[PDB]
Amino acid sequence: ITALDELPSFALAIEELYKREAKKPHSHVQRLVSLSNTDVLGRHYRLANTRAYNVLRMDQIFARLVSKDFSVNRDFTIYDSKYDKVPGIQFRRTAQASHMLFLWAICLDRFRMARHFWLIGDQSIINALVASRILERLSTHRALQGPHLAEERAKMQHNAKKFEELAVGVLGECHGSDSHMASEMLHSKNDMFNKKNAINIAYDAKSLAFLSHPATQSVINADWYGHLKSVTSFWAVLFAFFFPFFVLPFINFSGAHRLRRKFAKFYSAPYTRFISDLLSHFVLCVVTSYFVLDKLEDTISAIEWILLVWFVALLLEELRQMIFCDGIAEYISDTWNRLDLIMITLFFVGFFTHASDPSNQDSKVVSKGIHAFLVVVLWLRFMRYYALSKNLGPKLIMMMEMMKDVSTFVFLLLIFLIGYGVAAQSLLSPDEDFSSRTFIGVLFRPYFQIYGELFLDDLNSEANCLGDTPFTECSRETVRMVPFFLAVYILGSNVLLVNLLIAMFNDTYMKVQEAAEDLWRKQNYELCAEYKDRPFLPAPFILLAHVHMLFMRLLRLCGVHTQEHEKIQDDETKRKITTFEELNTDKFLRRWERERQEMLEA
Amino acid sequence: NQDSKVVSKGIHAFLVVVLWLRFMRYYALSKNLGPKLIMMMEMMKDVSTFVFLLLIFLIGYGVAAQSLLSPDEDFSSRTFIGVLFRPYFQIYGELFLDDLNSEANCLGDTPFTECSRETVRMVPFFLAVYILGSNVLLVNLLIAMFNDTYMKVQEAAEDLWR
Amino acid sequence: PHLAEERAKMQHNAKKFEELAVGVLGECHGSDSHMASEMLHSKNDMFNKKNAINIAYDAKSLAFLSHPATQSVINADWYGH
Ligand SMILES: CC(C)CCC[C@@H](C)[C@H]1CC[C@H]2[C@@H]3CC=C4C[C@@H](O)CC[C@]4(C)[C@H]3CC[C@]12C
Ligand SMILES: CC(C)CCC[C@@H](C)[C@H]1CC[C@H]2[C@@H]3CC=C4C[C@@H](O)CC[C@]4(C)[C@H]3CC[C@]12C
Ligand SMILES: CC(C)CCC[C@@H](C)[C@H]1CC[C@H]2[C@@H]3CC=C4C[C@@H](O)CC[C@]4(C)[C@H]3CC[C@]12C
Ligand SMILES: CC(C)CCC[C@@H](C)[C@H]1CC[C@H]2[C@@H]3CC=C4C[C@@H](O)CC[C@]4(C)[C@H]3CC[C@]12C
Ligand SMILES: CC(C)CCC[C@@H](C)[C@H]1CC[C@H]2[C@@H]3CC=C4C[C@@H](O)CC[C@]4(C)[C@H]3CC[C@]12C
Ligand SMILES: CC(C)CCC[C@@H](C)[C@H]1CC[C@H]2[C@@H]3CC=C4C[C@@H](O)CC[C@]4(C)[C@H]3CC[C@]12C
Numbered sequence A: 001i002t003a004l005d006e007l008p009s010f011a012l013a014i015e016e017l018y019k020r021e022a023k024k025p026h027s028h029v030q031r032l033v034s035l036s037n038t039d040v041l042g043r044h045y046r047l048a049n050t051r052a053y054n055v056l057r058m059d060q061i062f063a064r065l066v067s068k069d070f071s072v073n074r075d076f077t078i079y080d081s082k083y084d085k086v087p088g089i090q091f092r093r094t095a096q097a098s099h100m101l102f103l104w105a106i107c108l109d110r111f112r113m114a115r116h117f118w119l120i121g122d123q124s125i126i127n128a129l130v131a132s133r134i135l136e137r138l139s140t141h142r143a144l145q146g147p148h149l150a151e152e153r154a155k156m157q158h159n160a161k162k163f164e165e166l167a168v169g170v171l172g173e174c175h176g177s178d179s180h181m182a183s184e185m186l187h188s189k190n191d192m193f194n195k196k197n198a199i200n201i202a203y204d205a206k207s208l209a210f211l212s213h214p215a216t217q218s219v220i221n222a223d224w225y226g227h228l229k230s231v232t233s234f235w236a237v238l239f240a241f242f243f244p245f246f247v248l249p250f251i252n253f254s255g256a257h258r259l260r261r262k263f264a265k266f267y268s269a270p271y272t273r274f275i276s277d278l279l280s281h282f283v284l285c286v287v288t289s290y291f292v293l294d295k296l297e298d299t300i301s302a303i304e305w306i307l308l309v310w311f312v313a314l315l316l317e318e319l320r321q322m323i324f325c326d327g328i329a330e331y332i333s334d335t336w337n338r339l340d341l342i343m344i345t346l347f348f349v350g351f352f353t354h355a356s357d358p359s360n361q362d363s364k365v366v367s368k369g370i371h372a373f374l375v376v377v378l379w380l381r382f383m384r385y386y387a388l389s390k391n392l393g394p395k396l397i398m399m400m401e402m403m404k405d406v407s408t409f410v411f412l413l414l415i416f417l418i419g420y421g422v423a424a425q426s427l428l429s430p431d432e433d434f435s436s437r438t439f440i441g442v443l444f445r446p447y448f449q450i451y452g453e454l455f456l457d458d459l460n461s462e463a464n465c466l467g468d469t470p471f472t473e474c475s476r477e478t479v480r481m482v483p484f485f486l487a488v489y490i491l492g493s494n495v496l497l498v499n500l501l502i503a504m505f506n507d508t509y510m511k512v513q514e515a516a517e518d519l520w521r522k523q524n525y526e527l528c529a530e531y532k533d534r535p536f537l538p539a540p541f542i543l544l545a546h547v548h549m550l551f552m553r554l555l556r557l558c559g560v561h562t563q564e565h566e567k568i569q570d571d572e573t574k575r576k577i578t579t580f581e582e583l584n585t586d587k588f589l590r591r592w593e594r595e596r597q598e599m600l601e602a
Numbered sequence B: 001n002q003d004s005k006v007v008s009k010g011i012h013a014f015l016v017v018v019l020w021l022r023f024m025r026y027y028a029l030s031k032n033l034g035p036k037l038i039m040m041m042e043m044m045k046d047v048s049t050f051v052f053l054l055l056i057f058l059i060g061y062g063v064a065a066q067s068l069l070s071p072d073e074d075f076s077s078r079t080f081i082g083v084l085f086r087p088y089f090q091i092y093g094e095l096f097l098d099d100l101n102s103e104a105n106c107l108g109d110t111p112f113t114e115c116s117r118e119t120v121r122m123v124p125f126f127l128a129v130y131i132l133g134s135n136v137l138l139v140n141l142l143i144a145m146f147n148d149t150y151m152k153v154q155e156a157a158e159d160l161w162r
Numbered sequence C: 001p002h003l004a005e006e007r008a009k010m011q012h013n014a015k016k017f018e019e020l021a022v023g024v025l026g027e028c029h030g031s032d033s034h035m036a037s038e039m040l041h042s043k044n045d046m047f048n049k050k051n052a053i054n055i056a057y058d059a060k061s062l063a064f065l066s067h068p069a070t071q072s073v074i075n076a077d078w079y080g081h
């Protein structure tokens, strides 16, 4: 194989170190290779046993374990002597040797060795986050799980937290040095990290302490506003979306080609697509609520054709979100896309129920009676545009956390409710046969006694007692116990359970309010990413943008005349980012070393 | 003219709402009324985001209740009264379930039976959900908002009171 | 870009100057309350003929005005003569 033949002799020395590590008994390395089920070249195809510890198969079993779809750029052609007259190729080959010895020291979980190889290499934040996710995922692996593997997994998780702290401190020193150079650092896509930016590496690291740093939040807000400067508020961008032609020479951003490039820089922002998607969903909900409150005629109205083409455009948007998805399991795991599935499905049930017989009034009121369930569902999709607020977001995430404590509150009152309901339907009306009205006598009247309108005059009317004080001179002696079970059901419900929740909600708030802030900031990166991903046209026209995307895909696939240009980073600019990161890496290390000898105990 | 007199008293009602809101200012020299009044003006932002969280629950169950209570009817200002008036007072205690029995046109003994339509009965069920959410989730959440907002900025209310 | 660490250390120096005058007026309240009340109503001639409570208002520091000696000067100005 030409891939194993192209590796030089120091990669054979690292493979000899892997053979010496796998020559130890009860090794997790040989159990990790033995449960990898990959080929000797590195692909998962499910002689070769002798060279099974080569460094390319190690890089493939790291890149399968750390995330999905990584492939590092192992440029092994820089070790030739024909390219040895370059001024910076010795630092590049020291960087490749430090990266493979760093991955060897992460694989043997030797912390001081990996700290020294992380010191002498560059791109320390990205390598520390890949090592932190690699030691996060090595503890959850089945090959590294066993009887005697628990203390090594706990010390290796302590080493994962030790690598998690230091890159957050190095980016804190980068924010203390220069914020603009750190913002130029974090948008630089690494060539050895499969042409991805480091925020995407931080997302695949999935560490919430990295994304709650304010420098990464400033990089996310600068990517939110785009090429436009961030002096505008929400009402200024809303007035610019209301008046495009009267505000775009008046706005401060960045003869007619410069104004066309300023308008193309304005409409490529994700926050403009957020305002356009929120206005399109607000116009949907208002025009759909006006469709529900209007009386349906004998013929098909034009507003039903507008909502049919509108929701067919949302069905094409859901098919674009499913076809260009990042996995089909992640599409189901979004709550809002499942609400969009319930939205499109109940609109097809309501459209087929209205268009089965347009002259019948009974099919019209069955269609409006299911459209009532839809317009309950359509205002529950409007939570999603509350997530970019500073106040609505973590309280909405906290409410979706808080729903489990109401569900166990419902599971605790339910048996009180049905026990006093079967006692009240026994004592209110016995000597009667069993029907659906007996189920109405069990569940309807007790449920609304915990909310305030206990129906005690209605129990006086159903009790058949003709006294002045209302439970006297009754037809039966055994009916009077009604108020007494009420006196107990109401007491328990409005004193115990209702109050308990209050104490549940105080404790649940004071536990996970900061986890709601961190999951709100991770929702922040995801939204920015999703509304950077979404095209700029709103819903009514999104079918014309999907037709233009299908025409561009048909021109790229069949005619093959499509082309695109990408921005290439300069080598001196990336060398300035590398020397800025090396000056901060060293600075943070030294300060930590000054701060580590500044505590009491040492 | 008596009509100009009742228009003038009907705007003077808005004034005499405003004239007792100027009487907070002489509560600021008290040792007890002052920081709690400053804390109430701080606390108004958490009620405004509580109003911004219930509002879409309110208008969604209001457009569902005005759909199911009276369809086959034309659109008017009474349709807006059927969306916003009756749901808003169900979170305060007087749910109008006998009035929904009278507007539901059902002549049963137990009040939602023998109705003119099969599709009207879902009314109590959306209520069973709107009332649950409003008087269990949001109403309670605020309580936890007000405890956390008190325990954050009570000493900033003392310093801004001084 | 490079002014942030000097601005943070200079804000630390602003808090270091904010603590010491509150402690000096605490030592003035520990020495004599009547002489500190005669001190705080004295308008400085080099500070545009203004009293030091107005200088503290233009400083706008809430830790100075939450001291009880300044609150006693404010209550003595409330009751007047
Ligand atoms: C089932 C899942 C999708 C939940 C969605 C709720 C909607 C689509 C369903 C749930 C219960 C359904 C109702 C159940 C019973 C009846 C009575 C029948 O004579 C006419 C249809 C009608 C009035 C149904 C209309 C559609 C309905 C409201
Ligand atoms: C612990 C709590 C949440 C239990 C949940 C309440 C459920 C089980 C009860 C409470 C009130 C009930 C509704 C009250 C009245 C009617 C009208 C009639 O057509 C029978 C069904 C229907 C629509 C009931 C369905 C079931 C119902 C919604
Ligand atoms: C042990 C638990 C259940 C509490 C004990 C309470 C019992 C013993 C009491 C409380 C209130 C009482 C009722 C109050 C009044 C009347 C009306 C009378 O004409 C017949 C007995 C009857 C219906 C009583 C039966 C016993 C009763 C239910
Ligand atoms: C608008 C700002 C100053 C808020 C102050 C509220 C007062 C001044 C305003 C707000 C709404 C107004 C009312 C709106 C509508 C009508 C009906 C009209 O046939 C007579 C006047 C009357 C009854 C108005 C009287 C004045 C009024 C009550
Ligand atoms: C989330 C909450 C605070 C929403 C605010 C409630 C507003 C939108 C609703 C609630 C009750 C409503 C009022 C109820 C009844 C009437 C009488 C009639 O003349 C129509 C207008 C008027 C006066 C409504 C105006 C709008 C109103 C005040
Ligand atoms: C998935 C969510 C919506 C909860 C599911 C609840 C649905 C399936 C249930 C709960 C209560 C049910 C209603 C209770 C009673 C009746 C009266 C009957 O004559 C027609 C059906 C109808 C009107 C039911 C329709 C379906 C219904 C609304």
Ligand SMILES: [Ca+2]
Pocket: A118, A119, A120, A121, A122, A582, A585
């Ligand atoms: Ca280095």
Ligand SMILES: [Ca+2]
Pocket: A317, A318, A321, A336, A337, A340
């Ligand atoms: Ca979607």
